[PDB]
Amino acid sequence: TLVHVASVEKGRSYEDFQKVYNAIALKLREDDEYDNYIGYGPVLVRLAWHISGTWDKHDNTGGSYGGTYRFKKEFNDPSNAGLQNGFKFLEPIHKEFPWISSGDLFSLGGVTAVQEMQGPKIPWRCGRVDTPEDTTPDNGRLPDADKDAGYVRTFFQRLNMNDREVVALMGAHALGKTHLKNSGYEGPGGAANNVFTNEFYLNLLNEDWKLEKNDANNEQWDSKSGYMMLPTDYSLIQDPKYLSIVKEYANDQDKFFKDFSKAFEKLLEDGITFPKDAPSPFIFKTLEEQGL
Numbered sequence: 001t002l003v004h005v006a007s008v009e010k011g012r013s014y015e016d017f018q019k020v021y022n023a024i025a026l027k028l029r030e031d032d033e034y035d036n037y038i039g040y041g042p043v044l045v046r047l048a049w050h051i052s053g054t055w056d057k058h059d060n061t062g063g064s065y066g067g068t069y070r071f072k073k074e075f076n077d078p079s080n081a082g083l084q085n086g087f088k089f090l091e092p093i094h095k096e097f098p099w100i101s102s103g104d105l106f107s108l109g110g111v112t113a114v115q116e117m118q119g120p121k122i123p124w125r126c127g128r129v130d131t132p133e134d135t136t137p138d139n140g141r142l143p144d145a146d147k148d149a150g151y152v153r154t155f156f157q158r159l160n161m162n163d164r165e166v167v168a169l170m171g172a173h174a175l176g177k178t179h180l181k182n183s184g185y186e187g188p189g190g191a192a193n194n195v196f197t198n199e200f201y202l203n204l205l206n207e208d209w210k211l212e213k214n215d216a217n218n219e220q221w222d223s224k225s226g227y228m229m230l231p232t233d234y235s236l237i238q239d240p241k242y243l244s245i246v247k248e249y250a251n252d253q254d255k256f257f258k259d260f261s262k263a264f265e266k267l268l269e270d271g272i273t274f275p276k277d278a279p280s281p282f283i284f285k286t287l288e289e290q291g292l
């Protein structure tokens, strides 16, 4: 087991990171046409998850700390198809704030996106340090979408996530959409796909889903409303343990927000050792809270 100790970017404090947050949030507002006016919020959330979701608790390989998504092996992972859009978005931010590490920038992008899309506050800690190209994890550590509940459950044990954490994290599938050219799946999970809500769970329970083949010859569940669920999403209502939690979140927006916030921060921090005297986690104000 590798140790990665958080090391604060020299001399930086809350105000420095709130500036980076603000720069990301302002660009999110400005660049509003992307993906047929969905905007960049969803892809930034997905980027933060995929740079973290390479982690393996068994040896502390992968994970957000090293910022290794900047390297071509990872950038070109077929599981990461489409995330180049998020990376391109963050490039001018990194150029303006060259002092922030890549892992800190990619994870902060995800936090900023969730909060700006009216999601829960997600406490965030700085101190990821860029690591060399040879620390880049091999492709194939991110999950397949064509599998069942047992696959999902086992997969997430490698990220030290339990059933409640898994179900809560999957609620992010209310955001953005699947794109046939990226993943071989097509369509959004709901109507409000750039505002963070518990719609994923309501739609799983309330829509009439039909198992169909899309134009890439992959099965997905489709509703008459024009929504879709991946087999892995649908597995959350097939498995009785997942189903109970899906119902809980469909019936309690606040509980979903609180549980998502904890699991998402945990996901973004897996593999990182925080010194006892590290700064407390930062809670950034949204543009709206700042009157910006």
Ligand code: HEM
Binding pocket: 042, 043, 045, 046, 049, 081, 082, 143, 144, 145, 146, 152, 169, 170, 172, 173, 175, 176, 177, 178, 179, 180, 182, 183, 184, 185, 230, 232, 264
């Ligand atoms: C079983 C686990 C998961 C599977 C199999 C999976 C699979 C997928 C697939 C196939 C796409 C479509 C990519 C594209 O075509 O552009 C997608 C999109 C997305 N995923 Fe997941 N995902 C999983 C878990 C998660 C988690 C844990 C999060 C974050 C907390 C997340 C956040 C998102 C977001 C925000 C999008 C939309 C991206 C965009 O609109 O550009 N996913 N996911």
Ligand SMILES: COc1cccnc1
Binding pocket: 172, 173, 174, 175, 176, 177, 178, 187, 188, 189, 190, 228, 229, 230, 233
């Ligand atoms: C955003 O990715 C999605 C959308 C709908 C269902 N599953 C995943």
